[PDB]
């Protein structure tokens, strides 16, 4: 990877860039014919929002996603990981990938609510004040439809609406 350092000495600023150590993909992938990192390691349909060891490889230091052109993921897998990362942040599983705060900013104390499999951003969702009849019930989404094809080890399929 490459770092950019700004050093201001007196009246003169100097912007430079240095090449730091770069991690290398583990040798001998089990599926060399695979077209992206996911299927090269036979990981398609076999990871979830809590697989942070997997998810953390595709995000920036501050929690943002990395471009698909850089990672090499396909569109389908890139979108799954993107949603999984959002759920991982919301579940509190990435405590060292928090947003950058400008100097002098200390967030105020906010109520702590433990949550997981959170599809939407909390602030953008309204209360279900009218539930509706049994035959037209308003449901509370859980998880992501992008993961509907994940390997299911139970006889019941994943319920995405509660």
């Amino acid at each position: 990877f490459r770092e950019v350092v700004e050093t201001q000495e007196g009246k003169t600023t100097i912007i430079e860039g240095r090449i730091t150590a770069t991690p290398k993909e583990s040798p001998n992938p089990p599926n060399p014919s695979g077209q992206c990192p996911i299927c090269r390691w036979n990981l398609k349909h076999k990871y979830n929002y809590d697989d942070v060891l997997l998810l953390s490889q595709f995000i920036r230091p501050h929690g943002g996603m990395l471009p698909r052109k850089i990672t090499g993921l396909c569109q389908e897998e890139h979108r799954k990981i993107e949603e999984c990362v959002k759920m991982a942040h919301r579940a509190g599983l990435l405590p060292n990938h928090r947003p950058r705060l400008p100097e002098g900013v200390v967030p105020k104390s906010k109520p702590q609510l433990n949550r997981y499999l959170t599809r939407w951003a909390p602030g953008s969702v309204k209360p279900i004040y009218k539930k509706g009849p049994r035959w037209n019930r308003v449901r509370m989404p859980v998880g992501s439809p992008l993961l509907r094809d994940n390997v299911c080890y139970s006889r019941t399929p994943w319920k995405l609406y509660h």
């Binding site: 001998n28 992938p29 089990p30 390691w41 036979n42 990981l43």
Partner: peptide, 8 residues
Amino acid sequence: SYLPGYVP
């Protein structure tokens, strides 16, 4: 050290 069907 990874077999053909190895999955992490």
